[PDB]
């Protein structure tokens, strides 16, 4: 009967609200003053990467912290060198409209995808010596928002039609599909242990996903508007997301609620890209006010600016060792900072 | 010892070859013009897409087409494969020279939401520079609809009764004064949204088109000439 299910839903939501109320008994700024600050973070453009014609939507580093790929709206997917500023490859894409790019942790594969609804996979290490497309992943209806490689034969692809999906490249077909979102899931980051991945949507619901089970473990809603970028605080037990609410915040998986939010009165535009530094002290946030920003991830007060672009910052990717950070933007220029 | 130097050399010739390719594709990329076609599903956007396709073909996701007017490459993007929401994938269209907006003028209620879509396009932060070209399809259909009678535009638009035509090209389409009064009321209803805001960066360029039309490609040609003249003057900084 419908009213019994409605009162069960009432009991469930009262249980969730009471768990949030009784669980919340502390604040990170309030319980410990013994935190030491980060102070000024002056980041200078060590080297400027100038090949792209149109705006840049995604970049992704390699595991070696030297190579990095960036895809742009002219239809080029350039693999860069963060030392010599040299273009190892520049793959011309089928579709110009490419909102995402991912580079394999092994290093042999790189992926594109976007509004054309295909998540194409490009193999680099070949005996012929020319970059080719491995296979075309066609199981999505809405635009592809973000993709992340699991290994050489698994990739997870978030889309605009509520569907983030696990795949299998050499089959040519889906393996799993995660459908719990309401609309427009935008950015997804993989857990360090690779067993999990979280994904934020336009509902302002950032939903955890279990790869092995296939369903949503926990759902996080603490934002007032649609979500543009998400990450992992590299412990894997916490993660912070930045949305078009013009604020950003950090949720903990075990605490399963809002924990600490980073905002200011002056900032009146939403994060486009966010990422975490290696030790997780320096939250690093792109923005729509044409410059990046740098946030202390605990004390909740900004600590650095990377104003070197005169367009919105769409890309921000730290290295695996911490030896850089590279922010792309819509002026077709990629800048590595230190 | 020496293989580092050899790798530096080979990497250098690789970078030089890649940049030669990129300076070819810069000319290829700037030689063509991008046009985000957008509009309602009953609005005959696909009809004019077929017309300039005859005068390459879309496969999935985006139903692209290319057409040339006086050896100028026009390549325009009908975004049809995606979902009903459109707030996020339209941010990907600032390199576009001009949005093309197609409207079924005849179906009123299917015209107010066209007005709201224009108001959302105009005030979008990443489309503030982007200038709408506005088409008003189904001209003969609206002519019959307000000529035959019993479908009162005054019901769906209350200010049409007091509205009078200011100055217009009446005599050659002059089948009746009511059809011209109605159609100029509709374009003024779009243009009031157009000229309400803007720092001179973008402007609406309204046109009238029926079902069977061929010269609308040249209309986009002349429009895009005027938009690019305006932004070149803006880079020339004279105000």
């Amino acid at each position: 009967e419908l009213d019994q299910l409605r009162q069960e839903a009432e009991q469930l939501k009262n249980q969730i609200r009471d768990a949030r109320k009784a669980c919340a008994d502390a604040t990170l700024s309030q319980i410990t003053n013994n935190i030491d600050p980060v102070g000024r973070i002056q980041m200078r453009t060590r080297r400027t990467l100038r090949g792209h014609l149109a705006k840049i939507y995604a970049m992704h580093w390699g595991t070696d912290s030297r190579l990095l790929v960036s895809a742009s709206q002219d239809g080029k997917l350039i693999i860069w060198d963060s030392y010599t500023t040299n273009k190892v490859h520049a793959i011309p894409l089928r579709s110009s409209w490419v909102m995402t790019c991912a580079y394999a942790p092994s290093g042999n594969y790189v992926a594109c995808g976007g509004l054309d609804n295909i998540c194409s996979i490009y193999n680099l290490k070949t005996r012929e010596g020319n970059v080719r497309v491995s296979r075309e992943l066609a199981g999505h209806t809405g635009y592809l928002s973000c993709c992340r490689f699991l290994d050489d034969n698994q990739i997870v692809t978030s889309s605009g039609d509520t569907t983030c999906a696990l795949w299998d490249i050499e089959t040519g077909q889906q393996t799993t599909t995660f459908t719990g979102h309401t609309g427009d899931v935008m950015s997804l980051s993989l857990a360090p242990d690779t067993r999990l991945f979280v994904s934020g949507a336009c509902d302002a619901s950032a939903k955890l996903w279990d790869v092995r089970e296939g369903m949503c473990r926990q759902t996080f809603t603490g934002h007032e508007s649609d979500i543009n970028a998400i990450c992992f605080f590299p412990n894997g037990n916490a993660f912070a997301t930045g949305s078009d609410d013009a604020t950003c915040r950090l949720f903990d998986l075990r605490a399963d609620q809002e924990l600490m939010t980073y905002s200011h009165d002056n900032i009146i535009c939403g994060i486009t890209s966010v990422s975490f530094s290696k030790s997780g002290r320096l939250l690093l946030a792109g923005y729509d006010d044409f410059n990046c920003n740098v946030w202390d991830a605990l004390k909740a007060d900004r600590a650095g600016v990377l104003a070197g672009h005169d367009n919105r910052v769409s890309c921000l990717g730290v290295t695996d060792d911490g030896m850089a950070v590279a922010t792309g933007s819509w002026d077709s220029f990629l800048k590595i900072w230190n | 010892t020496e293989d580092q130097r050899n790798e530096e050399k080979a990497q250098r010739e690789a970078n030089k070859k890649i940049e030669k390719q990129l300076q070819k594709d810069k000319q290829v990329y700037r030689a063509t013009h991008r046009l985000l076609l957008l509009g309602a599903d009953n609005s005959g956007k696909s009809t004019i897409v077929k017309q300039m396709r005859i005068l390459s073909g879309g496969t999935s996701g985006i139903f692209e087409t290319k057409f040339q007017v006086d050896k100028v490459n026009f390549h325009m993007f009908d975004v049809g494969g995606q979902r009903d929401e459109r707030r996020k994938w339209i941010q990907c269209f600032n390199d576009v020279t001009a949005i093309i907006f197609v409207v079924d003028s005849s179906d009123y209620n299917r015209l107010q939401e066209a007005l709201n879509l224009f108001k959302s396009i105009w005030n979008n932060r990443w489309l503030r520079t982007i200038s709408v070209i506005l088409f008003l399809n189904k001209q003969d259909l609206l002519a019959e609809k307000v000529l035959a009678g019993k479908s009162k535009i005054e019901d769906y638009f209350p200010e049409f009764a007091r509205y009078t035509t200011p100055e217009d090209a009446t005599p050659e389409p002059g089948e009746d004064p009511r059809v011209t009064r109605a159609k100029y009321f509709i374009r003024d209803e779009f243009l009031r949204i157009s000229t309400a805001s803007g720092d001179g960066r973008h402007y609406c360029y309204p046109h009238f088109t029926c079902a069977v039309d061929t010269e609308n490609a040249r209309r986009i040609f002349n429009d895009c000439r005027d938009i690019i003249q305006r932004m070149h003057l803006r880079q020339y900084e004279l105000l």
Epitope: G183, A246 | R86, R125
Partner: nanobody
């Protein structure tokens, strides 16, 4: 958490009057350009009226321009719409639709999907 609580409805006779209420929570309410959307059964979902940030700029659908009056209390955290001279065709389900974004005038609140920032639903029939 996004919350849009709606109340006020029931059947009314033609030429009557009624009030719409849209209780909101979880966000800065004096910030967003809300709307009013309705779906008469058998038809699509259509926008009615819009209120900008301070409240000054108001626009109306060209059917309900003269009759309905829209207003809001940003302190009391509620949108309102006052009905006068109700036609027999104004039977519909009424949702207050909040924008995707703050600090801006563009707003895409018409969509047929499960738009996230639109109310669950209050029922008004005639």
């Amino acid at each position: 958490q996004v919350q849009l609580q709606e109340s006020g409805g029931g059947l009314v006779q033609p030429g009557g009057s009624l009030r719409l209420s849209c209780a909101a929570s979880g966000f800065t309410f004096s910030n967003y350009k809300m709307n009013w959307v309705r779906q008469a059964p058998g038809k699509g979902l259509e926008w009615v009226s819009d209120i900008s940030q301070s409240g000054a700029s108001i626009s109306y659908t060209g059917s309900v321009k003269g009759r309905f009056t829209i207003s809001r209390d940003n302190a009391k955290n509620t949108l309102y719409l006052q009905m006068n001279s109700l036609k027999p065709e104004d039977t519909a389900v009424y949702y207050c639709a909040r924008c995707p974004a703050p600090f801006t005038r563009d707003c895409f609140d018409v969509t047929s999907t499960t738009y996230a920032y639109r109310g669950q639903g209050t029922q008004v029939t005639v």
